Design a protein that fits this description.
It is classed as hydrolase. With 436 residues, the protein is an alpha/beta fold. The chain has helices spanning 11-26, 34-45, 56-64, 67-86, 110-121, 137-140, 146-167, 171-174, 191-197, 241-248, 255-258, 296-303, 325-339, 362-375, 388-401, 406-415, 427-433, and strands at residues 2-5, 92-95, 103-109, 126-127, 132-133, 177-184, 206-209, 221-225, 267-274, 279-281, 288-290, 306-311, 347-350, 379-383. Strands 3-6-9-12-8-13-14-7 form an 8-stranded mixed beta sheet, with helices on both faces. Strands 1-2 form a two-stranded antiparallel ribbon. Strands 4-5 form a two-stranded antiparallel ribbon. α4 (67-86) packs across α5. The chain is elongated, with a radius of gyration of 23 Å.
């Protein structure tokens, strides 16, 4: 098993880092400027060269604070997160690949999670043998493209907000359990096996929403449109569905420290006990951190933990046949293996999985997820992401095919590409035409 090294693993550097951290924590060294913070980050990173562009984005967030909160940041926040790092007892974190039909479960207390996120903030998580880092050093760094700096700053703001909150945890909240599971789901079923397994399965309920998002459905199994490397570009430039979820729920960051290796076709990830610390507006280059408000629903987002399912769709290019038996069976397996987890969460909250960055056609991905949900004997919520035309089409297909045989529905789907309808009709339009 790979062991991701924590700072204590490098015993000689840790002598230095520990003293640095302790004098900040105790107030023996008092930071008086942002430049003094740069200096301490340089020591912790064991930098060779001075280049203030290394902290450009962190400086931007700091300079947006008011003068009282700048003082707070230097004199209270940094020292307190140094103190969290000093609470770490482990020297490394296990990165296990489970055997067939087994799980690798990594449990942590909610405060422990905060210790590791503090490591990320202070740029002390790197495996020097592998030349891999799992901290905020890239996000801090000035990019040549302005919009990429703004993405990075906005991410920083979300992580900072979480760490402020984590510093204020009650003893009860601090000892709550956060669990990460890497689940090997056993043997892949091929396309003909799928057709056979579906023969007595009836399609189940779908609820459509055009104005709510996945994270708006507490109490459901909420889907992360993952990269096979959990988190994808969260510690770089990424800022679409998966990365936004990690920004609003930064406890998810610890998944990166236990799931180094890419998910296999028959693996899924579950994260349990995850709270939401930030709100947001926009998306990608328009994403901005929004402070969580104090309504009843917003307090609930902050206080009530959720379970997330991370499943990675295929990353298609334009020449791939998304309807091939091989590619359909791949997505049926990945979705169903995910959806059937957590059998007490009888509703799946999902949407355009694989159909943004990964170039999937949503008509087919809808059909595949509905088959998977149905086989798992769960209901599904589909978020259309402010796409009224898709909502209308899916509503018609749902009304026609609800409670119909799933095996035959799959076969009708798979007839589309060779049909007389392929040229002039979308998949959804063809499914409707079959009923005319």
């Amino acid at each position: 098993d790979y062991q991701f090294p924590l700072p204590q693993k490098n015993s000689e550097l840790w002598i230095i880092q520990k003293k640095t951290l302790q004098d900040l924590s105790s107030g023996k060294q008092k930071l008086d400027s942002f430049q003094s913070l740069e200096s301490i980050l340089e020591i912790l990173r064991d930098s060779k060269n001075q280049n203030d562009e290394k902290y450009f984005n962190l400086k931007a967030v700091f300079e947006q604070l008011d003068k009282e909160e700048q003082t707070y940041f230097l004199e209270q926040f940094i020292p307190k997160i140094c103190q969290l790092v000093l609470k770490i007892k482990k020297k490394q974190l296990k990165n296990q690949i489970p055997k067939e039909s087994k799980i690798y479960e990594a449990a942590f207390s909610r405060e422990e999670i905060s210790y590791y996120v503090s490591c990320m903030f202070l740029c002390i998580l790197k495996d020097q043998d592998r030349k891999i880092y799992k901290d905020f050093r890239l996000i801090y760094l000035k990019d040549l493209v302005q919009q990429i700096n703004i993405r990075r700053q906005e991410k920083i703001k979300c992580f900072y907000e979480y760490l402020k909150q984590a510093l204020d945890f009650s003893e009860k909240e601090s000892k709550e359990v956060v669990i990460f599971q890497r689940i090997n789901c056993g043997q892949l079923e091929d396309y003909e096996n799928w057709v056979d397994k579906l023969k007595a399965i009836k399609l189940k309920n779908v609820q459509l929403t055009d104005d709510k998002l996945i994270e708006d459905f507490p109490g459901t199994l909420q889907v992360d449109f993952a990269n096979c490397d959990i988190g994808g570009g969260i510690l770089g430039n990424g800022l679409v569905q998966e990365q936004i979820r990690f920004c609003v729920c930064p406890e998810m960051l610890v998944s990166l420290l236990v799931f180094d290796q890419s998910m296999e076709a028959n693996e899924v990830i579950i994260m349990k006990g995850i709270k939401q610390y930030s709100d947001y507006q926009g998306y990608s280059n328009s994403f901005r951190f929004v402070k969580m408000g104090n309504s009843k629903i917003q307090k609930q987002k902050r206080n009530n933990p959720q379970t997330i399912l991370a499943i990675d769709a295929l990353c298609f290019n334009s020449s791939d046949n998304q309807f091939s038996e091989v590619n359909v069976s791949r997505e049926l397996n990945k979705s169903y293996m995910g959806f059937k987890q957590e059998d007490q969460l009888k509703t799946i909250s999902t949407g355009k999985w694989g159909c943004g960055a990964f170039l999937g056609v949503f008509d087919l991905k809808f059909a595949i997820q509905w088959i998977a949900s149905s086989r798992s004997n769960k209901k599904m919520i589909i978020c259309t992401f402010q796409d009224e035309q898709t909502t209308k089409q899916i509503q018609q297909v749902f009304d026609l095919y609800k409670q119909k045989n799933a095996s035959i529905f799959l076969k009708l789907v798979m007839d589309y590409p060779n049909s007389k309808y392929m040229e002039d009709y979308t998949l959804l339009e063809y499914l409707i035409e079959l009923g005319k």
